[PDB]
From a paper:
Finding a correct substrate is especially difficult for the [name] Nudix hydrolase [name], which triggers 5′-end-dependent RNA degradation by removing orthophosphate from the 5′-diphosphorylated transcripts. In [name] and probably many other bacteria, [name] converts diphosphorylated 5′ ends of transcripts into monophosphorylated ends that accelerate subsequent cleavage by the 5′-monophosphate-stimulated endonuclease RNase E. [name] [name] can also remove pyrophosphate from triphosphorylated RNA with lower efficiency. Here we show that [name] binds and slowly hydrolyzes NTPs, NDPs and (p)ppGpp, which each resemble the 5′-end of RNA. A series of X-ray crystal structures of [name]-nucleotide complexes, trapped in conformations either compatible or incompatible with hydrolysis, explain the low reaction rates of mononucleotides and suggest two distinct mechanisms for their hydrolysis.
To understand how nucleotides inhibit the reaction of [name] with the RNA substrates, we determined 1.6–1.9 Å crystal structures of [name] bound to triphosphorylated nucleosides and/or their non-hydrolysable analogs, ppcpNs, which contain a methylene moiety instead of a bridging oxygen atom between α- and β-phosphates. In all of the structures, the position of the nucleobases is nearly invariant, while the conformations of the sugar–phosphate moieties have small differences. All of the nucleobases bind in the protein cleft where we previously observed specific binding of guanosine at the second position of an RNA ligand. In this cleft, the nucleobase is sandwiched between the guanidinium group of R27 and a hydrophobic pedestal formed by V137 and F139. Pyrimidines are locked in place by a hydrogen bond with S32, while purines are likely held by stronger cation–π interactions with R27. Thus, the NTP-bound structures demonstrate that NTPs interact with [name] in the same site where the second nucleotide of RNA binds [name].
Residue numbers in the entry: 0 to 86, 89 to 160
Amino acid sequence: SMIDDDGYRPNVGIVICNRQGQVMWARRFGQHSWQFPQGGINPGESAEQAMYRELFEEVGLSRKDVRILASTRNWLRYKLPKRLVRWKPVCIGQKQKWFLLQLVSGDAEINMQTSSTPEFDGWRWVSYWYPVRQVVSFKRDVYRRVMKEFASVVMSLAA
Ligand SMILES: Nc1ncnc2c1ncn2[C@@H]1O[C@H](COP(=O)(O)CP(=O)(O)OP(=O)(O)O)[C@@H](O)[C@H]1O
């Protein structure tokens, strides 16, 4: 992704849910910190195209394995801790468009190991609200807003 005027790189985030009130939670490669899939937008790519590229490259899935249930409307931004800014044009954060997907294929279709440098080691199902308290603090405000925006849909499926 290319950094914009203000130092924010455009990215997409992905919340994948099932019908049990759960979302797909993934362990950052070589870490004990966990997060949702997120990926950059290449020039020319739409947000939806970037999302399906992230879905393929780091989750191993096709359009055909999911259905899009919702999308956030505007960019949601987080700023990197000043200690984590890699030095230009220097990136100070991300602006993100988020997607809620329902997994309709089997769990075994998920493959997080196809890249030579995976985003993730692997994943597990967690309860819907578990991500807000478990994600790194500088993303917590973005996560709280996304999970609130998506909450009605996931809970209705879970009934
Ligand atoms: N949960 C976490 N705990 C500690 N550090 C984290 C973290 N999540 C992210 N970071 C740090 O924040 C930096 C920026 O992370 P992100 O904004 O998630 C993009 P990235 O993971 O570096 O991949 P990218 O190549 O797509 O940019 C990373 O170098 C990472 O070390």
